Amino acid sequence: QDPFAGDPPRHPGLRVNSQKPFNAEPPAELLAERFLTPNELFFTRNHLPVPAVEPSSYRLRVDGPGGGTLSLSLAELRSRFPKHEVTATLQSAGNRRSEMSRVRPVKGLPWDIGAISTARWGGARLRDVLLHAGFPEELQGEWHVCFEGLDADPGGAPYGASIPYGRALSPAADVLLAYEMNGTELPRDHGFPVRVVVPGVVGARSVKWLRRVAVSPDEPCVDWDTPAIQELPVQSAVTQPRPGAAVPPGELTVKGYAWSGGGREVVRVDVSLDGGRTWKVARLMGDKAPPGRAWAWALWELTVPVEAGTELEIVCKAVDSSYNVQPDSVAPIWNLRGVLSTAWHRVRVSVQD
Amino acid sequence: QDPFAGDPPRHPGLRVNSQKPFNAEPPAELLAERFLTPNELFFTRNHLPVPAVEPSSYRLRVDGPGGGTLSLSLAELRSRFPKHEVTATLQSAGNRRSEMSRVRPVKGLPWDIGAISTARWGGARLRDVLLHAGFPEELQGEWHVCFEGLDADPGGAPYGASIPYGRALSPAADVLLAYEMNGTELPRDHGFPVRVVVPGVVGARSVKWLRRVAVSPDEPCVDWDTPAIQELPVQSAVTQPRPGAAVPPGELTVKGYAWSGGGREVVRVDVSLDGGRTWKVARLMGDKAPPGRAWAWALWELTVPVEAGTELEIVCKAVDSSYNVQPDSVAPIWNLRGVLSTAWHRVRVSVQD
Ligand SMILES: Nc1nc2c(c(=O)[nH]1)N[C@H]1C(S)=C(S)[C@@H](COP(=O)(O)O)O[C@H]1N2
Ligand SMILES: Nc1nc2c(c(=O)[nH]1)N[C@H]1C(S)=C(S)[C@@H](COP(=O)(O)O)O[C@H]1N2
Ligand code: MOM
Numbered sequence: 113q114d115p116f117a118g119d120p121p122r123h124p125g126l127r128v129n130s131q132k133p134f135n136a137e138p139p140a141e142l143l144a145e146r147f148l149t150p151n152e153l154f155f156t157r158n159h160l161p162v163p164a165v166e167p168s169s170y171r172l173r174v175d176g177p178g179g180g181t182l183s184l185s186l187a188e189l190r191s192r193f194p195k196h197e198v199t200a201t202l203q204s205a206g207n208r209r210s211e212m213s214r215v216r217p218v219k220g221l222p223w224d225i226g227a228i229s230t231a232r233w234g235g236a237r238l239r240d241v242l243l244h245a246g247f248p249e250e251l252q253g254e255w256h257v258c259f260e261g262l263d264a265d266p267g268g269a270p271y272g273a274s275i276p277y278g279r280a281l282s283p284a285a286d287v288l289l290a291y292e293m294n295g296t297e298l299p300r301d302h303g304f305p306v307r308v309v310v311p312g313v314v315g316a317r318s319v320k321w322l323r324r325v326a327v328s329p330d331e332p333c334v335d336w337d338t339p340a341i342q343e344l345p346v347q348s349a350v351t352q353p354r355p356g357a358a359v360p361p362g363e364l365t366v367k368g369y370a371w372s373g374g375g376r377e378v379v380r381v382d383v384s385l386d387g388g389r390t391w392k393v394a395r396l397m398g399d400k401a402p403p404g405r406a407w408a409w410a411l412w413e414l415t416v417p418v419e420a421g422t423e424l425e426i427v428c429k430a431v432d433s434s435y436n437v438q439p440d441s442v443a444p445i446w447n448l449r450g451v452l453s454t455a456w457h458r459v460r461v462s463v464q465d
Numbered sequence: 466q467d468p469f470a471g472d473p474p475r476h477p478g479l480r481v482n483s484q485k486p487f488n489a490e491p492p493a494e495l496l497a498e499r500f501l502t503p504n505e506l507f508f509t510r511n512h513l514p515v516p517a518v519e520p521s522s523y524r525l526r527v528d529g530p531g532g533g534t535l536s537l538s539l540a541e542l543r544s545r546f547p548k549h550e551v552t553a554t555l556q557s558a559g560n561r562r563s564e565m566s567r568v569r570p571v572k573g574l575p576w577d578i579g580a581i582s583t584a585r586w587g588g589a590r591l592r593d594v595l596l597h598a599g600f601p602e603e604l605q606g607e608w609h610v611c612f613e614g615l616d617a618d619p620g621g622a623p624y625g626a627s628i629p630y631g632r633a634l635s636p637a638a639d640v641l642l643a644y645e646m647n648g649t650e651l652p653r654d655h656g657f658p659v660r661v662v663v664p665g666v667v668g669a670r671s672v673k674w675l676r677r678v679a680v681s682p683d684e685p686c687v688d689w690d691t692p693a694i695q696e697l698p699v700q701s702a703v704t705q706p707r708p709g710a711a712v713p714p715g716e717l718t719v720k721g722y723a724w725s726g727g728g729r730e731v732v733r734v735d736v737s738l739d740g741g742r743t744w745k746v747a748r749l750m751g752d753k754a755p756p757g758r759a760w761a762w763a764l765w766e767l768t769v770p771v772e773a774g775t776e777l778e779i780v781c782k783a784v785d786s787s788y789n790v791q792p793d794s795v796a797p798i799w800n801l802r803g804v805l806s807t808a809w810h811r812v813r814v815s816v817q818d
């Protein structure tokens with residue numbers, strides 16, 4: 113009777129926004145504690161019940177107008193294409209939706225600051241699979257690559273998303289058919305046995321439980337948005353301390369994350385303790401990625417003296433390697449879907465006497 | 466842990482398309498057996514958990530630019546406005562979606578032919594409530610009336626829908642704030658204590674568990690579609706016999722329903738037994754409504770001789786009082802959302818030897 117009966121167990125203490133389907137984020141106090149988010153804490157966004165996949169009979173279908181159909185086993189995907197490792201942060205379009213909900217009610221799961229997580233993904237390059245199928249580096253005209261999941265709507269339509277053909281074929285874009293996550297088998301909640309990972313691009317495009325790759329001209333495989341969000345803008349949030357905390361006087365360590373879409377590196381994080389009147393530069397920690405390939409977040413921290421009996425409004429904002437900035441307030445960027453919530457994050461705390 | 470824990474019990478033997486949220490239709494064999502669908506069989510379409518409403522503290526808010534705020538109790542809605550009774554058929558936008566799914570996979574609950582049901586609704590006229598609030602018969606410019614339900618998205622947004630101001634204020638449009646269904650209290654699944662009923666218009670606009678009525682100019686209250694389907698076209702379906710049935714030779718009684726949007730009366734139902742090559746006119750049964758106020762379906766039947774050992778393809782189509790017709794096939798009207806499935810219904814049966 114329960115369509116979600118076969119869903120996997122999860123780590124206790126996740127912040128669960130929806131049980132069926134399962135949508136949850138790590139608690140903020142753990143989010144910035146490790147550069148790579150442990151698989152058990154990695155935020156989970158499921159539209160549907162989690163597919164149960166027998167690994168030996170699993171086949172990935174690859175097709176398209178000038179290709180020729182492949183039916184690839186998991187063994188074949190592991191052995192016939194060189195394995196690549198890409199460290200990439202996935203962020204939901206609705207990350208920080210609850211801050212937008214606070215201004216005016218929205219539609220969608222009220223994610224806090226934790227609909228974002230980072231892993232080292234291992235797999236075959238989509239580029240290598242598509243070239244093997246007979247697709248060329250370049251096609252005359254505008255084309256896309258569509259991905260279908262094994263999870264399907266009751267009406268029949270599988271979860272699907274697409275990316276431009278140029279991104280799918282680019283050596284530098286690092287698009288993976290990932291079968292490995294942080295050194296181990298892809299967990300069920302994260303797309304076992306195979307997912308697409310599209311670095312620098314909204315999480316929605318990294319299709320889990322992959323069943324079909326299809327090449328198609330721009331104008332069947334359907335992207336669920338039926339323009340559509342691809343790259344995301346600059347994002348940052350304070351994960352320590354937490355809203356409403358009472359902190360002891362003396363030194364305070366403020367920590368958080370920052371990230372930008374499209375492989376743009378975070379080059380600076382500014383932190384304020386007085387609601388954005390004065391700023392100090394945070395120390396950044398990251399993987400120092402190649403130019404235009406900064407797929408992973410920067411974790412940041414700043415240790416600052418705080419005075420007994422005062423009130424703090426901690427604010428952070430980031431700048432990327434193309435010198436993009438964040439908007440300063442939520443109200444002007446508000447939208448009914450509560451997506452693209454990237455205004456300066458503000459956290460109010462009191463300093464104890 | 467379960468957001469649907471407080472949902473009401475339902476009649477067993479409904480065709481359940483979704484348990485949580487609850488979406489179900491009566492079985493086809495019972496659908497056309499009564500002109501008024503029993504409350505327990507009336508199709509149910511819920512987006513969310515069913516609100517639990519204590520009736521004495523319930524208040525309906527009525528507001529808008531040139532109105533002045535009302536807070537109406539259930540007692541007040543029953544006593545201060547003349548009660549009207551309107552027999553109206555509600556039909557889901559996705560009625561007969563499964564036939565569209567068969568052509569090509571769609572998104573949405575795969576309703577069969579039963580996402581349609583008819584009741585005699587009792588309540589206050591929306592027109593009378595709005596006039597009482599100080600709204601005039603006519604407003605200069607384009608305006609709408611928005612309805613919000615007590616059921617809200619996790620992001621905060623209540624279920625909502627709107628109708629043009631002209632329809633809300635028209636004496637002939639029969640828009641009701643209904644507190645009565647087929648002579649009894651509105652059941653929980655059908656909007657207890659108060660729902661809007663918008664006759665002649667897609668079911669989505671008849672907002673259940675009503676909390677707010679708001680008048681607003683065309684360009685806050687949000688219609689969930691964020692043009693939007695209002696009136697529906699001609700519809701018909703065969704409910705007896707059922708697909709795949711083996712019927713005895715001799716006489717066969719074919720039965721079904723027909724309906725058209727906007728208060729347009731069904732004036733004819735044609736029935737074929739040979740896939741649409743030859744047709745006979747069915748006998749119609751209905752409430753013989755006033756011109757332009759045919760809110761309720763027509764039930765139809767035809768008794769025809771059938772020959773032992775033959776194969777039948779039973780088809781029906783209807784014509785309304787404005788001489789609108791149904792399209793003949795699903796493929797040309799197919800759409801990803803699987804709505805407006807109104808092609809000629811075809812049912813294959815075998816005649817026994
Ligand atoms: N097949 C499938 N792929 C999917 C989804 C889904 O529901 N089904 N959710 C998408 C969305 S909206 C997001 S944000 C990411 C989340 O990936 P994660 O659950 O591994 O964090 O998966 C994407 N890929
Ligand atoms: N508040 C509220 N009203 C609502 C809905 C809902 O989910 N919430 N569903 C709508 C839709 S899409 C339909 S088809 C009808 C169905 O009404 P019924 O469940 O009484 O048949 O209710 C409409 N009114
Ligand atoms: O819905 Mo996804 O981009 O979290």
Ligand code: MOM
Pocket residue numbers: 510556557558559580667668669670
């Ligand atoms: O979704 Mo409604 O018009 O059944």
